Amino acid sequence: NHGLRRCLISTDMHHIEESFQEIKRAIQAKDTFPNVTILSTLETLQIIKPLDVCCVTKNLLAFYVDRVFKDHQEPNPKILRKISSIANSFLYMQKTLRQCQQCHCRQEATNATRVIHDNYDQLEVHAAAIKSLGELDVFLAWINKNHEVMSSA
Numbered sequence: 662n663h664g665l666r667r668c669l670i671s672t673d674m675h676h677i678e679e680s681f682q683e684i685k686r687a688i689q690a691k692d693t694f695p696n697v698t699i700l701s702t703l704e705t706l707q708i709i710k711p712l713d714v715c716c717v718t719k720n721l722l723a724f725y726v727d728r729v730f731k732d733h734q735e736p737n738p739k740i741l742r743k744i745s746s747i748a749n750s751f752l753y754m755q756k757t758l759r760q761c762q763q764c765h766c767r768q769e770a771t772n773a774t775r776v777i778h779d780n781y782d783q784l785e786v787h788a789a790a791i792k793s794l795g796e797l798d799v800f801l802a803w804i805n806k807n808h809e810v811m812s813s814a
């Protein structure tokens with residue numbers, strides 16, 4: 662049913678949000694293409710129906726885990742510790758989502774997702790990874806609006 666919005670309830674948005682707030686300035690300060698958004702799809706209302714939101718959520722989690730987190734090399738240990746915490750949260754969110762799931766990807770959801778990979782691939786890889794990292798607020802806002810998520814805020 663609409664329950665697909667309950668697959669991340671065990672995730673604590675506040676936890677991720679806080680870890681991110683800690684490095685948000687330092688990471689966003691390195692965004693070399695501010696006039697553009699890698700998560701452009703998440704600034705539109707193209708993905709709002711339950712089934713599409715579930716598909717895009719799992720695609721975005723994989724986008725971060727398999728692409729962003731692999732591509733960003735972080736020499737600052739304090740920043741890396743925060744990003745590890747976020748990464749750990751995302752791994753949990755993927756675990757939770759597995760447990761849940763329907764969640765199939767209709768062609769519109771799939772395309773919405775490819776747009777992001779396509780924007781990402783427009784940039785040099787390290788700039789793409791740090792910029793994506795900087796857009797975590799766009800990702801958290803979208804997750805927040807489309808899922809019953811818990812907050813210890």
Ligand SMILES: *[C@@H]1O[C@H](CO)[C@@H](O)[C@H](O)[C@H]1NC(C)=O
Nearest residue numbers: 694695696697698701780783
């Ligand atoms: C991004 O910035 C450029 C710079 O002039 C401007 O055309 C507009 O604000 C944006 N352009 C696009 C479509 O990326």
